[PDB]
Structure formats: C-alpha cells, structure tokens
C-alpha cells in the first residue's frame, strides 16, 4: 500500500488527490476539488495503516484539507476517512465530513457529510 | 491567527488526550491517546486548520487523522475528526468524527462509525 | 418495554420540541417543532423503535423522520434522527441526524448535513 | 408530485429490497429486507417525503426508519436513511444512513454506523 497508495487518484466528481505514503504511516500531498469554493491545489496531510491485516481486508486511512491556499479561503476543512483496496481496479473508498467555521448560532448546520470513491483512472 | 489558542493539550468527554501543535502554515501535528477502544498510549496525528479565519465571530475550521497503529497495538482503523475551534474563556474544539476499519469487501457496508467529540482545555 | 418511557414531550439542546407516541407495535408518531432553520410550527414525524430491547442495561434503539413541509413552509428537505433512548431519573434520547435537501445533480455533493441532538424530558433555559 | 414515482419496489447495491408506498400526505410506508447483517425477511418501515418538491430540477427529499425487530430476529438497532429521489429514465433514490445499536453507556461512543445506499428500480 506504500507503493499502492502513492500516486494520483481521481474521484467521481473529477477531483484530483495527489498523495505520497511514507514508510512511517504518513500521508502527504495535494488536493484539487472539481466543485465548491475551491481553486487549484490545497495542502493535505493524513495517516494510513502501514501494516494492514493479511486476510484480504482493506487498508484504513484518512486525510484532511483546510480549504485555504494562495487563491481562496473557504473557512472550512474536509476530512476523508476510508480504506484502500488494492488490485487491478484499485480504489480508495471514503466517507467525508466538511466543517465550516460558523458562529455559535449557526453551528448546528456547520457540517456536511458525503462519500467519495477514488480510482487511479479518471472517470 | 489561532496558532497559540489551538496549540496545547485538550481533553474530550471520554477522557481522551489530544496533544497538538498548530503551525503558522496551517499544519496540525501531535499525538492522541484514547481512553476507549482498541488503543494504548499515544498515536501520531496530523491535520490542517484555517490559519486565517473569518473575523466575524465564526469558529476556526480544522481536522486531523489518527491511524490506530503504534508500537503497542494495531487496530487496522483510522479516525478523522472534522470540526471547529471556538476561542474564549471556555475554549472548545467541537468535532464530528468518522472511524473506518479495514474490512473485506463483504464487510465494507459496516466499516465506518460516526460520532462526535467535544474537546476542552480542562479534563473531565 | 419503554412505550411509556418514550411517549411524551422531549426537548433538545437547541430548544426544539419533539412530541412522540410510542405504539406497542414499535411505531413512533408525532410532531416536531424546530427552534432553528427554515421551519415554523409543527411538522409530522414518523419512525420506529425496538419494542423489546435487551435486558442488559443497553439503551433502546430508535429513529424517526421529518419532511420539512407543513401548511406554513416547505424547505424541500428531510431530517432523520437515529439514536437510542436511555431510561432512568435523567432519561435521554441521544441521536445523530442527517438532513438532506433536494438538489440538482450538480449540487448533490453538498446535499446532506450531519449533526447530533440530545433530548431530555425538561427543556433548556 | 412524486407519489407514483416513489411508490414501488427498489433495490440497493447490496441487493436489499425496499418496498414503499408514498401517500398523498407525505407518508412513506412499507417493508425492508436487508441482504446483509443481522436480519431475516421483512421489517416494517415508516418515513416521510416532500410531497410538493421544487420545480427547478431538484430531487425530492425523503427519509425512513427501520427498527431491526420482526417475528424472526431482534438486532436491537435501528437504521435511518436520509436522501432524495431523482426521477426519470433511470430513477434513483440516493441516501446516506445511520445505524444505531442499543448500547450500555460505556459502549455508546461506538453505537452508530454511517453509510450510503443507492436504490434503483431494477436489481443489480
């Protein structure tokens, strides 16, 4: 999964996830969203299980993007939680949480939830 | 500019300990120790926060990840917390979280727990 | 088991009012009044609960739905609460919820909010 | 508006069967049969939908609940699906769901699974 996870991935929206998996469990890279209040690349950091089970299970992982870069600041952050599944049609299947910074009176509606599936090939 | 407000030791309602450093570049680095679950001692965390939040009283958006592997245990799972920091006398980090376990394909429909943790600067 | 415990008026941390009847057959019926959002007055709710919960001290699983349309407003959205009832001197219903808004396909990635509400038998100030 | 479009038999990606009647008043009634999990045969479901959806091409919001007790099994849990119906040649109901199991207080942090199901009018 070190070599399997490292590289360029694309989700069903056409967003681009560029990641390097380190031997120590680290995830580092950039994310470019095809939708939303976003332009160009944003820093991402995360972690993955660097010694997954040998029983055919996937490899658990997660990462975060704060939606601030040199071009825009959406005052929000998304975390993706999911698992990498290797093989001919490799995939990273995730669920995600997008929290906006809000006032206290708006906090009940601060967080979106969704799900993204990443594949090595762009749909 | 919540670098100083976020950096430090935080505790959630379960008694877990979140130790974080906020970097000027938006980085979150540190350790997490869960009071519950398949866990022992500290685990590495990394994440990101909005280093230039709005100045209208809104909170500061942030998130981080722990993969539950350390030198003592490997639960083959990862949790991400997504939330916002609220400064002030009773500073808080209010989060929702997703915990995904590595599964076979047949078990993937039940791979992911959801919950919510509130962190404060004083422990329960 | 908890028909009488669940039936009644409950309030969450936002000051919303959840009025429910638990039927012997597992049904939940009632009305919801949200203190926040694109809502006024009462909306119909329906749901289900475990009418024969475990006897080991576990809570009682339940859930319900509100579609945010009534005679006054239509927010073109629906919220589902999923949770458990915990009986005792300080009874509580602890939930997580999903609010989905009807969207076009291009907006569907941002259709769904998630949150958490705790309901008690006495309301906040 | 979508009473006739929603009413009927639907199937998700797991092969589960969702049988629903949409009432003129916004009610949803029917049965659910899960292809996976601690489940056998049909369970009662009830829910609600927007009976006067927007006319700008948006989907129709809806949700429903199953408590996983029937004459055969009791899993002491309930699932709520929250989502929208999208009409047309390939009609679909896209949902996210929350499955809460009754737990003791010490296990409540891990009480709730989250997932997503897509329903179509023809089985995979």
UniProtKB/Swiss-Prot annotation, chains B, D:
Q: According to the UniProt entry, where does the motif Cell attachment site sit in this chain?
A: 48-50
Any GO CC annotation of this UniProt entry: extracellular region
Where is this chain's protein located in or outside the cell? Secreted
Which terms in the Gene Ontology molecular function aspect does this entry carry?
A: biotin binding
Q: Where, in this chain's numbering, is biotin bound?
A: 32, 43, 81, 97, 109
Keywords noted in UniProt: Biotin, Secreted, Signal
This protein's source sits in the domain of life called: Bacteria
Asked if Signal is a keyword of the record, the answer is: yes
Predominant localisation class? secreted
- Residue ranges constituting the Avidin-like domain according to the UniProt record: 3-124
The family annotation for this protein states: Belongs to the avidin/streptavidin family.
- Function comment: The biological function of streptavidin is not known. Forms a strong non-covalent specific complex with biotin (one molecule of biotin per subunit of streptavidin).
Could you give the subunit structure recorded for this chain? Answer: Homotetramer.
Supply the name of the protein: Streptavidin
Organism of derivation: Streptomyces avidinii
């Amino acid at each position: 999964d070190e070599a399997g996870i490292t590289g360029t991935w694309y989700n069903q929206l056409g967003s681009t996830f560029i990641v390097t998996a380190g031997a120590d469990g680290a995830l580092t890279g950039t994310y470019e969203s095809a939708v939303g209040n976003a332009e160009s690349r944003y820093v991402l950091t995360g972690r993955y299980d660097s010694a997954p089970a040998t029983d055919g299970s996937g490899t658990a992982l997660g990462w975060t993007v704060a939606w601030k870069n040199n071009y825009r600041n959406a005052h929000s952050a998304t975390t993706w939680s999911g698992q990498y599944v290797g093989g001919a049609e490799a995939r990273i299947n995730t669920q995600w949480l997008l929290t906006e910074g809000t006032t206290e009176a708006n906090a009940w509606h601060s967080t979106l939830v969704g799900h993204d599936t990443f594949t090595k090939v762009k749909p």
